[PDB]
DNA sequence: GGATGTATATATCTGACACGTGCCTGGAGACTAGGAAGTAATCCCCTTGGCGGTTAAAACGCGGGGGACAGCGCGTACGTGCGTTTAAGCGGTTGCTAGAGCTGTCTACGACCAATTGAGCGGCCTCGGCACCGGGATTCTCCAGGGCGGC
């Protein structure tokens, strides 16, 4: 069977632990338990669900197909969440 | 006697200054209308310092036990290091499409103004329901007569 599905469905994955590690070192975090990297998976899921369908909705008002940096900076600052350094 | 360390001179690289040009956006000048400052009147809320009385909350003290904290043991789960794998990062192909920018035309849609009128705010009268007063029906406590016993 070496044919198998085009997409990829485990980029949550991706997010790997050293990676969570180094997130958490830059953090200040010294010991990090082993059930850390899948709440963080969970987290990071979460809020990147909310801010990507906020830049969705911005980009689907605008007519258009591409996600431009300024409706991520729109999405981010109904949010709450400023950034500075893409525009505006 | 030969080659090495070091000083001064010359060519080249690179950030910065000034020159040039467009253009378009800000500034100068004039006019006008209305936003806001000022005025007067009326009425209601807030301020400061008091008094009186109720009463429930606040304060104080004391006993006791529940909980916070310290110490110790232990075992497990995470850190650390190394060898191996793997996939990120970079550079690259190849076409098509999305999108920004610019120019151009036009049309439907919204601003604007005048006349109108009907939905919102206040008071007035009435009804639904709750309550006060008068009258009829039902049940409970009581005073007196009859009969029996004693000297």
């Known amino acids: ?6 997409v990829l469905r485990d980029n949550i994955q991706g997010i790997t632990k050293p990676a ?3 997130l958490a ?3 200040g975090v010294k010991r990090i ?10 987290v990071l ?7 990507i369908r ?3 909705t ?8 591409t996600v431009t940096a300024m409706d991520v900076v729109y999405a981010l600052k109904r949010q709450g969440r400023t950034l500075y350094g893409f525009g505006g």
């Open 1 to 6: 069977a070496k044919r198998h599905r085009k």
């Open 20 to 22: 969570i590690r180094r």
């Open 25 to 27: 070192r830059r953090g």
């Open 33 to 42: 338990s082993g059930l850390i990297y899948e709440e963080t998976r969970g």
């Open 45 to 51: 899921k979460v809020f990147l669900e909310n801010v």
């Open 54 to 56: 906020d830049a969705v």
């Open 58 to 65: 911005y980009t689907e008002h605008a007519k258009r197909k």
